[PDB]
């Protein structure tokens, strides 16, 4: 079961600033009243974060999962109904399902056939003075199901913050979270919160794209009021400050601005007056040039190798090879040889070196 | 048909070819010409057979 909800208003993906959010605990190591620098995939400070609505407007596009993704959903009147993970999402490869409910949560991992519009249905006011849930259409069939445990519920203007960080390292899917009240400020709140990890998943597969899941005939329909944030993580060093209780009360992006760089070098948040040496400066190359002599005659490897008459070992045939273009790829890729060993060089890099003089010793 | 060198006075230097067919002075007491159980031929043949 799946229905294509093709009715939506043409709105481009807006952007906004992710001020000081997205900091989690990179490791399960307690630290007391100390400042620590560790480099991993974090959310950049003062970075631009994608802006999505749900109005009329039903934003649900496929988005890549390149090296961790930050998800925050300032979504009062809960309609968020999980996430989609995998690389193909068409039952050919294993895919991940996460859902939510009032008192239940299911993490579902199977080779799932995902329809182009996967969503969970929610009917409206069936004369029972309450909303009930049914008619969920996220996949079609369960083909190869492997990892399917059930956890405990985690469901806690807008008044709830559901900042989640998803990281997949060595096949381990990591989920971090933090809930705190929000008082107005329609953008990301101006405050620092640390996302404690929730689960670790031994999926062991590749996740390249993701998708969000929301609640709910099909054509000409209006989405419930929602807004969720999508940011992309890249490897950048940080400087996390731990208090006596051991929680990260503040952090500094080691590559944000020169002041942050100096704080990162000094391993301190406050900086005394003076001049501080920092990381070096350089100009990176803009384009790569290659200059070889324009000789066109191919080297005589044909009769060098496929010669019918190979002499005796004490009369090894030494042939002079020079002033020709030698294509070693045809030798390397052809697996007809039982021993293709190079000592001072590598067989794969032979097609990038121009040699002074080459000897061939066939015997 | 594939012959190899077996007897020599020392190890040949790298990339050196030695095709001298002269009899090696294998034994402690030198013997010259032909061979007996001494001063044997420095070339032997591979028995390459399918």
């Amino acid at each position: 079961q799946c229905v294509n909800l093709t009715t939506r208003t043409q709105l481009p993906p807006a952007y906004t600033n992710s001020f000081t959010r997205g900091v989690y605990y990179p490791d399960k190591v307690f630290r007391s009243s100390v400042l620590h620098s560790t480099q991993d995939l974090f959310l950049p400070f003062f970075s631009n974060v994608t802006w999505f609505h749900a109005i009329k407007r039903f934003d649900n596009p496929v988005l890549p999962f390149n090296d961790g993704v930050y998800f925050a959903s300032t979504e009062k009147s809960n309609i968020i109904r999980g996430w989609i993970f995998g690389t193909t999402l068409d039952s050919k490869t294993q895919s991940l399902l996460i859902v939510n409910n009032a008192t239940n949560v299911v993490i579902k991992v199977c080779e799932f056939q995902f329809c182009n519009d996967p969503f969970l249905g929610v009917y409206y006011h069936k004369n029972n003075k309450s909303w009930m849930e049914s008619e969920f259409r996220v996949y079609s069939s369960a083909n190869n199901c492997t990892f399917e445990y059930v956890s405990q519920p985690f469901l806690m203007n807008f008044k709830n913050l559901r900042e989640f960080v998803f990281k997949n390292i060595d096949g381990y899917f990591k989920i971090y979270s933090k809930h705190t009240p929000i008082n107005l400020v329609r953008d990301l709140p101006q405050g620092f919160s640390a996302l404690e990890p929730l689960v670790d998943l031994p999926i062991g597969i590749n996740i390249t794209r993701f998708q969000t899941l929301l609640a709910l005939s099909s054509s000409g329909w209006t989405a419930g009021a929602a807004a969720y944030y999508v940011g992309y993580l890249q490897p950048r060093t940080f400087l996390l400050k731990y208090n006596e209780n051991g929680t990260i009360t503040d952090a500094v992006d080691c590559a944000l601005d020169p002041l942050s760089e100096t704080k990162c070098t000094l391993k301190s948040f406050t900086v005394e007056k003076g001049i501080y040496q920092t990381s070096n400066f350089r100009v990176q190359p803009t384009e790569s040039i290659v200059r070889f002599p324009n000789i066109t005659n191919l080297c005589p490897f044909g009769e060098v190798f496929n010669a019918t008459r190979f002499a005796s070992v004490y009369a090894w045939n030494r042939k002079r090879i020079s002033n020709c273009v030698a294509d070693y790829s045809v030798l390397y890729n052809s697996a007809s040889f039982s021993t293709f060993k190079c000592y001072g060089v590598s067989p794969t890099k032979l097609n990038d070196l121009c040699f002074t003089n080459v000897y061939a010793d066939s015997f | 048909n594939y012959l190899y060198r077996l007897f020599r006075k020392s190890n040949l230097k790298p990339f050196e070819r030695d095709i001298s067919t002269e009899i090696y002075q294998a034994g402690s007491t030198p013997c010259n010409g032909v061979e007996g159980f001494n001063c044997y031929f420095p070339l032997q043949s591979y028995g390459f057979q399918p």
Partner: nanobody
Amino acid sequence: VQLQESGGGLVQAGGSLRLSCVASGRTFSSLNIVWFRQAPGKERKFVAAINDRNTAYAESVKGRFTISRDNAKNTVHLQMNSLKPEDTAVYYCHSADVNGGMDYWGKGTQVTVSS
């Protein structure tokens, strides 16, 4: 460029044969010859070699032969004396040049001898 070995006719025990290994080349004097022996279906062996200054025979043909050189012709020749019926083999002749190791192996000649 190549070597051809012709000869090895039908003779009697104790007779004399004249086998020549004419070589297609221009410096075969430098390419000293080596004579090899193969039994009819048994393991191979060598015979002789006139390596320029001196000579070297085998145990079966020790001194019984008169190896000869044709330097003015760039050809080699072996003289066969005191032939025996137990020497029924296929003599060879080969030469490898000093520069650019290479072989000019021949074909062979029968050494059938009656008893």
